[PDB]
């Protein structure tokens, strides 16, 4: 991994490939190694670069344990310029992932050349919306979540192994809890379940995600939606992938899996993104 | 003690007596418990309001983990908004306490009737001002800080107990170690530690507490200084002592104590107090 300096911290990075950047965003809890499997798809077409986010993964952590939306997308913006991925982006995003590329492609859409986005955030969240998951997510932004999130780890011996359908190994699971060896350490994972906007709360969050959303539903960006069956976020019958499946210049892909979707179809979601560079790196 | 919802957290206060305000403010990582014998002084002359700051005492925490000074200081104003303790407001302030204490009479001096103060922050610091604390708090501004602080709890164990002359007892370490029982609730002593402005940085709050330097070196507001013998921030010998003894229609007392004055000195304190507060109240 390469590592850069951002603000006050510092944040590693995949970098492999050359020509025009593809950019891959993880979420919760997750890492760039998410994406370990996506990036060979890609990486003789593009330059792929997957940072792993502050306090996440291989980085550098908060030292005033800013780990709120806002923060994440101030330390983000630092990678962008530092790394110079200003030109022709395509980013490929998850999770918050999402949020954070799509907030991108809001305020510099002039270096955006396409988004490939798979259970995004593509609207501020109902309850309803959290079907299986909502009792879990109720309780973490609760004070009960002090507990669970950061004295038992909820998210990555819980959440990650309920998200994939296939059985992840020992080893998966080792890199997965690396990051997180303390409670002192897992503060962003409870963070980002405390700043989902769902319903109107919290309201700034719930400001950009909107202000975002109204943009991408306008916007004539080129997209690549990946669908997860049965997925989590995005499911049939779900408002928030109706909204999705109205956003325009988009196509659609289906793939086999749960929320964390990349570690049961890596292959076909790396052949539909590397269609959708290519084809997008053909109206440039 | 009463409790009251304050933004996104609830602070509990000790509120005693009837009349005009006194408002006692603590600092890192004590509480109001740090005023217990220096209230009864107060307290069939005022009404005696002493707040835990949030994430200390018996107070909430923040559900963001939003500890900076910035945080603390909109708490607290949602405090001070809520009781309604905005007319002739005698401030007790100490350590972040006074910084507090300090930016409020700032921003609303027409509020403040008098200001009690003792080993405060009066203006930015320099590392040579810290004396003998400073091989600790520069480790704790670098990444051992986590450790030391989060860990190893030192604010509580080591640095309270060297701050007091005399020897505390086994039920007064027990009331200052109940709010940190976990490495994971420790995080506001390390945020107090790495938001102090030394020689620039933090920008933010170096800013702040310049503002209200230069203002209150120039404020007519009625003043008590209280300097301990040795004392630790404000000593015989440093610029900050001396910056403080240039603040106007001030009043000075001394008393014996190292940092944690209260604890070896609060009967002499109480009266020094006293006979303020009832001076302020005949001229007012």
């Given amino acids: 991994m390469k590592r850069v300096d951002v603000l006050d911290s510092a944040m590693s990075y995949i970098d492999v490939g050359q020509g025009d950047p593809i950019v891959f965003l993880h979420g919760n809890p997750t890492s760039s190694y998410l994406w370990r499997n996506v990036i060979p798809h890609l990486s003789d077409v593009g330059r792929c670069l997957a940072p792993d986010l502050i306090g996440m993964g291989a980085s550098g952590t908060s030292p005033t344990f800013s780990y709120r939306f806002a923060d994440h997308v101030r330390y983000l913006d630092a990678w962008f310029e530092a790394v110079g991925i200003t030109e022709n982006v395509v980013l490929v995003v998850h999770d918050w992932g999402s949020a954070l590329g799509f907030y991108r492609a809001l305020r510099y859409p002039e270096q955006i050349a396409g ?42 011996e819980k959440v990650v192994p309920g998200g994939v359908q296939r059985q992840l190994t020992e080893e998966e699971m080792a890199v997965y809890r690396t990051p997180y060896p303390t409670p002192q350490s897992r503060i962003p994972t409870l963070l980002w379940a405390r700043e989902i906007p ?51 210049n988009q196509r659609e892909v289906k793939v086999a899996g749960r929320h964390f979707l990349q570690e049961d179809s890596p292959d076909a979601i790396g052949a539909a993104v590397r269609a959708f560079v290519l084809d997008v790196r053909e109206r440039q």
Same sequence: chains 1, 2.
């Avoid at 769902?198 to 950009?208: I, K, L, S, Y």
């Fill in 115 to 156: 988004i490939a986005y798979m259970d995004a955030l593509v609207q501020p969240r109902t309850w309803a919306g959290f079907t299986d998951y909502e009792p879990l997510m109720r309780a973490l932004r609760t004070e009960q979540g002090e507990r669970m999130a950061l004295a038992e780890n909820v998210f990555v």
């Fill in 198 to 248: 769902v319903e109107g709360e919290p309201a700034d969050v719930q400001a950009m995600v909107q202000e975002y959303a109204d943009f991408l539903s306008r916007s004539d960006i080129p997209k690549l939606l990946i669908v997860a069956e049965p997925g989590a976020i995005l499911h049939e019958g779900g408002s928030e992938l109706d909204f999705a499946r109205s956003w325009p």
